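Retro notes, structure queue

What went well: the backlog is down to a handful. What didn't: a couple of records were mislabeled last round, so from now on we paste the full input next to the output in the thread. Example, using Periplasmic binding protein/LacI transcriptional regulator from Burkholderia multivorans:
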Amino acid sequence: AGKPKVALVMKSLANEFFLTMENGAKEYQKHNASQFDLITNGIKDETDTANQIRIVEQMIVSKVDAIVLAPADSKALVPVVKKAVDAGIIVVNIDNRLDPDVLKSKNLNVPFVGPDNRKGARKVGDYLAKKLKAGDQVGIVEGVSTTTNAQQRTAGFQDAMKAGGMKVVSVQSGEWEIDKGNAVASAMLNEYPNLKALLCGNDNMAIGAVSAVRAAGKQGKVYVVGYDNINAIKPMLKDGRVLATADQYAAKQAVFGIDTALKAIAEHRKQAELVETPVDLVT
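Corresponding output:
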């Protein structure tokens, strides 16, 4: 009897988060090589929605049995998901949740595997708050603003700052990227000479913010927090350039996404018939 073929469709291949995710998925397939085949794909940067859509369309022609998708845009990927589901493919959503209203309006059910990013960001924000004081000015460097996970991290960060008495003076998108993150951080430091921290929606933007802080001669005076716990951030936690990040377990999301799809396939479930993963503070 034939193995199901599962497609894992990710965002930016530049981003270690997804390389970590990909490695996890591939290791999982290797251990379970007789259970399923795995096709992995990503896009060239964090904002290449168009190409991600193309990848999913290419997965629909190859007649894969399931697609596990980390969508680059929470609304824009919904049409091609519908296309996939109507073609009898099981789709599981990971990482960044597709917009529920847009889903509800195509009569579409898509199971989600991923974290509560508001609680996750709140953990990171809370640790920072302990180091700051009431009235301290901070800026939030946000992911792609049309993604659920970007919005929810910003909200968690805001929750933490409110609860501590800090003042968020700026919220701007660094579009999940190092250099756009850097540009935003630099603008915020220039705008606010009294800025005390930069709260970044992912580690890549945090790396950008660390560069901006250094370039402003503010190393040691402006805290930076991120999210993802990528390897590149570890020397920065160790030497103090970054105060905290969070592990949201990339490999787990992909593996549990794949398992969700395979379980559905094992039981011959229909899409219409169809999981919070944890986030831990890292310092």
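Agreed that this is the format going forward. Reviewer comment attached to the example: Residues 1-113+251-274 form a domain with the Rossmann fold fold (CATH 3.40.50.2300).
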